Design a protein around this ligand. Sequence first.
Ligand SMILES: O=C(O)/C=C/c1ccc(O)c(O)c1
Lengths: 118, 117, 114
Amino acid sequence: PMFIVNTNVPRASVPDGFLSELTQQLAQATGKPPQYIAVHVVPDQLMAFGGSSEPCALCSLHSIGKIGGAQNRSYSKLLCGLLAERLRISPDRVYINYYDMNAANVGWNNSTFALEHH
Amino acid sequence: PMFIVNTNVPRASVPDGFLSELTQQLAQATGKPPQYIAVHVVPDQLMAFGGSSEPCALCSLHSIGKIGGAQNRSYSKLLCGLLAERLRISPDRVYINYYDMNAANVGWNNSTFALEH
Amino acid sequence: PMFIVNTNVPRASVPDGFLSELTQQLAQATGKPPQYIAVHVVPDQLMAFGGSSEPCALCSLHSIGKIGGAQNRSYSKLLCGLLAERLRISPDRVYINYYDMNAANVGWNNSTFA
Ligand SMILES: O=C(O)/C=C/c1ccc(O)c(O)c1
């Protein structure tokens, strides 16, 4: 799984340990080994949410499977809680786009995760 | 709705009220309250369009609904219009990827927009 | 086609000619004319892959068609090769998301591709 956070919170406000905590907590939430998890945090962004430049975040989570109604609600509670506690961003100023990727459409290590056909 | 612009135009060339302008214009175009509109502008990018580093932009518009053939051409005229006028980017050097998101696949406020099941 | 690379490799390590090489090689691999290929490289990113900050890349390739099982494997071999040779990123620390775009969902030049 791959998690990206873009935010107008400044770099100096991102705590030591943030990327490792996201890695661990995502591995736990998705039931996937942490070796697979990629995390990417982009601070100091020029952004508005509702026309206002109070802290906010635009995020994406891409996974092959483990995406769905109940699961995505759990991920949102986890990730919003982390963004609130660590970055001081209000949960109602956060969007997370969830993408259930097909294995054939994820490249890795010179190939893709679809090894069965064609 | 969420609109993201990545561009090689420098930061100093982005006008002070551009984020506010995009917000109001997208609210009107989509018929959604501005409170739901998020805008993200990323200047000074290392990018090329057709092998050239003249001004260009790579963009995305995500919405739950209000995405489709006729609507998207309307969004393209509006957004290219704004990019040309405000950032001085030729419309033929802009790409906009449109995504019609399912409510269940958009997280917000500790949950998603799918409150029904 | 639109190709984006986000990486923690520093800007100073991106070699002269990298965007041109990406453009030319994507044109060759996808068949599409180079005049319409857009490439975007974002270095110096705060990133981890498997919990480690050794060099890594998160990438996307969007194309109207030319996306599929065998074609995507070929793109991955090409693009991981370039990231390995040019940016010194191990291929097993690269993810590439492939998107087959509907022409009505791609804006360009005041309109769409449909
Ligand atoms: O990134 C995008 O928004 C898509 C751009 C694009 C532009 C021209 C093409 O022929 C194509 O397949 C895709």
